[PDB]
Subunit: 133 residues, 3 copies
């Protein structure tokens, strides 16, 4: 292959932070970079190249069955390993992320058309609310 | 109901940062997330769950009426309270944000196809230009 | 003109970091904001304004012809001047970036299905893979 015409969506990206530490790129910018995924747009006429690099934030997938213990690696937040276990309490999904931080977990439940999430760690409680699309 | 299937768009997020500090998440990451809105995709079959979760940069709304003060809380920037007043000067919105920073305000005007915005704080001026599409 | 209705997409943004320095914005937030492009949707009629400001990550453009030296201001990364050259080698675009960092450059090619990118600085490599859409 010698022609690249099209829009290319990135699927893998290794040692990005290593490359940037080799460029002495500062730590805040690096924490930005490692959460991004790229899609480059490339048009070629002969040896002539037009390319544009585009970003958007990385997506994060947590899969589980209720009642089955599983290892979660908490990328997207604190990058810790935890034994996550999800259970029903009424119609409220309750997960406990057993591990290094005490009293760490989250509850989730639907009321009317809205989703309700409580994320807990120690003393602290974050309360989020969602609308269905 | 124990059916969580669908796409759920966040609309409220209290104490995200308390939750993140309690996980000992570094300052820069705490500043990245905090500007984000979150839409969670959930595919549930009985007790089997897949969640995909996506993040976008949070929107920032300012609505005002000219010649009447209003309360700007400068999220997306410095997180300060200011009392803003937008007056006319010919066809130029001129706004002063009384508050802590002396000589803080902005100016906004249309010149043909383009919108011009000069943001001022003390000795520093930032000039932005927007094409109408 | 006194009418501002429309969606306006940013095109230029000078002294943004200076304005943010005057406002005492913490370093990480500055390093985030300076990487953004903004679109303002404005709704008017009268003196009653409704503005929604939205942000996305700024694109980063690199245009060249295979063989012609060109200066790069590595804006998306370490903010450095390099003199870049891109050559064919077989079916593989081979760019070198002469400048302050030894062994800086990248290699880019397609393997039927997918696009392959390899950035090198010093002895460090970053390896990326894109699927065509
Ligand atoms: Zn985005
Ligand atoms: Zn929100
Ligand atoms: Zn920092
Ligand atoms: Zn960011
Ligand atoms: Zn971001
Ligand atoms: Zn972002």
């Amino acid at each position: 292959t010698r022609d690249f015409n099209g829009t290319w969506e990135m699927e893998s990206n290794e040692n990005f932070e290593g490359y940037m530490k080799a460029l002495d790129i500062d730590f805040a910018t690096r924490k930005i970079a490692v959460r991004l995924t790229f899609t480059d747009v490339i048009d070629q006429d002969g040896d002539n190249f037009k390319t544009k690099a585009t970003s958007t934030h990385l997506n994060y997938d947590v899969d589980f069955t209720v009642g089955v213990e599983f290892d979660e690696y908490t990328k997207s937040l604190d990058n810790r390993h935890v034994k996550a276990l999800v259970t029903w309490e009424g119609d409220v999904l309750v997960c406990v992320q057993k591990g290094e931080k005490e009293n760490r977990g989250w509850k989730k439940w639907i009321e009317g058309d809205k989703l309700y999430l409580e994320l807990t760690c120690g003393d602290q409680v974050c309360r989020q609310v969602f609308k269905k699309k």
